[PDB]
Amino acid sequence: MNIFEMLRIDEGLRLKIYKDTEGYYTIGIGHLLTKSPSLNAAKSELDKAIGRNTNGVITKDEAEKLFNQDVDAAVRGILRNAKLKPVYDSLDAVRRAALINMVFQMGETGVAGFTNSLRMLQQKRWDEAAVNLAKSRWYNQTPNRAKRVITTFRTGTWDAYK
Ligand SMILES: [Cl-]
Ligand SMILES: [Cl-]
Ligand SMILES: [Kr]
């Protein structure tokens, strides 16, 4: 298991524009296209991201490409954020993947806001962090996925994913 396979399980793969859990237009492996209610706008952002007239549909390879770029960007976002980097550098490999997953889902900003959890993770107070992390909109809106990431931080193993 690794970050890619982990996110591929949590996000799935769809080759046609779809709406995510929040109703936003997305494609591929969780690649958000736009928060706008306009499908044309979505189609527009898609063609711009792929570089061709896709008509709302992409291939597997193109989806994989976007995903790679999105994972890369997520890590880079973490390393560039002053609230995040320190946590990330303090963690072991498995838990780092958990933090990247959260960022990929909710953005750097969103994650940087879990101040209290962040501190518990940094202190290696696993059970405590897990409990504070569950007290969130994130957990109540996508509880199965959230439980998987939370168990990951709690245990430091990939058991939630096997
Ligand atoms: Cl893009
Ligand atoms: Cl879920
Ligand atoms: Kr967090």
UniProtKB/Swiss-Prot annotation:
Gene Ontology process terms (BP): cell wall macromolecule catabolic process; defense response to bacterium; peptidoglycan catabolic process; viral release from host cell by cytolysis
Chief location category: host cell
Consequence recorded when altering E11N: Loss of 84% of enzymatic activity
InterPro entries the record matches: Endolysin_T4_type, Glyco_hydro_24, Lysozyme-like_dom_sf, Lysozyme_dom_sf, Phage_lysozyme-like, T4-type_lysozyme
Residues annotated for substrate binding in this entry: L32, F104, S117, N132
Active-site residue numbers: E11 (proton donor/acceptor), D20 (proton donor/acceptor)
Known outcome of mutating G30F: Almost complete loss of enzymatic activity. The enzyme is destabilized by 1.5 kcal/mol
Gene Ontology, cellular component aspect: host cell cytoplasm
Outcome reported for the amino acid change (mutating E11 to A/F/H/M/N): Complete loss of enzymatic activity
Effect of D20C: Nearly no effet on specific enzymatic activity
EC numbers, comma separated: 3.2.1.17
Function according to Swiss-Prot or TrEMBL: Endolysin with lysozyme activity that degrades host peptidoglycans and participates with the holin and spanin proteins in the sequential events which lead to the programmed host cell lysis releasing the mature viral particles. Once the holin has permeabilized the host cell membrane, the endolysin can reach the periplasm and break down the peptidoglycan layer.
HAMAP family (alphabetical): ENDOLYSIN_T4
Protein name from the UniProt record: Endolysin
Upper lineage: Viruses, Duplodnaviria, Heunggongvirae, Uroviricota, Caudoviricetes
